[PDB]
Symmetry: D2
Subunit: 114 residues, 4 copies
């Protein structure tokens, strides 16, 4: 199935934060309405934050996360979970290698903000 694609409410600010757990430099691209809105880059094996930003979901609300490492797209796993009918998490894990730990870049999207 497609992974890393989420429909947010329109015109809504959301947070996006990425963590790295890999020897490879992770490049995380966040696309809003099909256009690149943020790009994070970094390397850690200790869950460092490699980027955080606040974005607006725009007219459609479409948000897509993509991850690549040494020019190759990582395999993604994702889900959205909603707590108390209010608090939304869009979660992505990614795998750049052969161990299927799926933590190589971890991306958390959360809304609402404020």
């Amino acid at each position: 199935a497609t992974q890393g694609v989420f429909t947010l409410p329109a015109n809504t600010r959301f947070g996006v934060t990425a963590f790295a757990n890999s020897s490879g430099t992770q490049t995380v691209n966040v696309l809003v309405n099909n256009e690149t809105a943020a790009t994070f880059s970094g390397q850690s094996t200790n869950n460092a934050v490699i980027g955080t930003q606040v974005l607006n979901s725009g007219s459609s609300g479409k948000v897509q996360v993509q991850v690549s490492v040494n020019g190759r797209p990582s395999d993604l796993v994702s889900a959205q979970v909603i707590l108390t009918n209010e608090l939304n998490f869009a979660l992505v894990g990614s795998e750049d290698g052969t161990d299927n730990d799926y933590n190589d870049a971890v991306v958390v999207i959360n809304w609402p903000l404020g």
Copy 2:
């Protein structure tokens, strides 16, 4: 129900990260096997990452998150989600006020690392 309590695998490193979305200064306490292991604080209405840390779950794997604002416990919501039977997120929201956005402090725990 009790919220903000998670059983992790024993002797496992995990990340804990907190975000703020409130006019009130948030204080986030992270307990591991019933003793404080990390404390984060800050004040933002734009999702600032007020703290992030790597901890070890220790022998019994018990991790608890508590949130307070001006000495008053916040009401918590939480859940754990597991992707591809590998990648774990323990999620907490909290409410310090009257609007029930539950984002006033948001805490994300992730494992495994590395």
Copy 3:
């Protein structure tokens, strides 16, 4: 925090299924737009299905699950999970006793159908 309340897309059919795991007879009510839409009751300690129905979320999309045992409201815990940005689960557990298993009535809502 409020539990067992979910906002569905309007005019959408959804399934609701309830299971029992308790010595007490479980009464499960499903409200749509603040009005009773379905009621199930039964008793099992081995996960029997005590009710299943297809409902329409109607003009409001507002769905609430309530659980009680002989006039005593059970404590609920709930969350919504979305897979591949398409497949939705609204999940409820409930506790009628002292063991905090939260399985005494379990309610699963899923959409879309068809």
Copy 4:
């Protein structure tokens, strides 16, 4: 990523329930320790419960869901959710066609029971 594979606690009873939403007849197989322990088949476009069963995770705890339509495997999506650190849902959707609704067979596993 692998989907539909879950690690349960050993020697633990769990419920498994399957729903259908497709013109095609769904075949759902639930494997415990790599052998089929339950099978359900049926056709519905209205979320029929094509089967429910209580199984034991046995000595290994590995549980796998497979879905096919006249022998053709369906693509799966899955996740596990844990509420109040005690109530577990393992969730599966599947796609047999071209519309990406992922509801063609839906499988929910819950534990603990009793």
